[PDB]
Amino acid sequence: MYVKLISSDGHEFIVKREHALTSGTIKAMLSNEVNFREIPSHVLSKVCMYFTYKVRYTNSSTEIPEFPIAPEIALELLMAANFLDC
Amino acid sequence: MDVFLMIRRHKTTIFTDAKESSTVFELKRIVEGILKRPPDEQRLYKDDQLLDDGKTLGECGFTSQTARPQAPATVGLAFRADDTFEALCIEPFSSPPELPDVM
Amino acid sequence: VLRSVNSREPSQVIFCNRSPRVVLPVWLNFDGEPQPYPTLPPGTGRRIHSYRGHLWLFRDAGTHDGLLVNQTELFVPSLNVDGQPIFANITLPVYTLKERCLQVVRSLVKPENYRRLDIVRSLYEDLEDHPNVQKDLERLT
């Protein structure tokens, strides 16, 4: 089961429901498409990668790599993470 | 070994994982489950290269160490509109703003 | 509360830095004061002498971001079985996306400039509230 997360510029990101529920904010907006008027695709794509990373590396013994964030997106990404509580 | 992918067409992007040992066709079946279009109406691409149904993702260069959770590899998708296949077209993501002075 | 016990029973330990960070080992002394020890570059190890019932924790040496040791916050050396050293595997935690963003922003903006960034005051405060061992000692208590 997948949900659709839509960026402010209309990009549709389809990710596993359980991955997206990493965000308590997204849980609420669902409880299965969500529009994000303030989050552009270059940020929302990164948020989706974060979900994948978190789910994969939580409760995991295999060594954990650094989640990479380009300087250019760090501010907007910070603002999205704060809104999404993840 | 799991590979982590972005399957992209126009303004659609699917985040999913698959086995390195799984096939292109099997990846079409996954897309089918999500976008409701059968495999015979799909072409998958690595960059501009059309991928063959019977090849493994690993053979086609999607490996567990390059197609990572935090940096998934991109697979292009094109659909057959009725008779003929549309050209592969992937809309770029938006562009980030200029770094502020303070950064 | 969180203080090393003065046991006198030796214990050899391998501090193994399996993170990409320069690591600062911190020993909690008998009065509970954090005592910094020499750093470990990324991917390196040190054989060190410690004691049973001594408390350690580990941080990014530059930013004080929290690290895990054997999957938890604290490491206490135990009894060496058959002369083998105890392994202390230091790893990155999975940070929240927020904390990770704060790390990257902090590493790009000099603290004087946090006020210049266009964000809700509460993120200014979040940025300014740097990781700090003393704070975490109060959080663990």
Ligand SMILES: CC(=O)N[C@@H](Cc1ccccc1)C(=O)N[C@H](C(=O)N1C[C@H](O)C[C@H]1C(=O)NCc1ccc(-c2scnc2C)cc1)C(C)(C)C
């Ligand atoms: C006065 C004394 O020797 N007291 C013993 C207990 C004891 C032992 C024998 C007899 C009586 C009491 C004791 O607890 N010593 C403490 C002690 O030796 N410690 C505290 C911690 O358990 C570590 C150990 C210690 O400092 N070991 C040397 C050491 C030196 C470097 C490093 C590190 S950390 C990263 N890189 C390095 C090289 C790690 C350890 C000190 C001297 C700091 C108070």
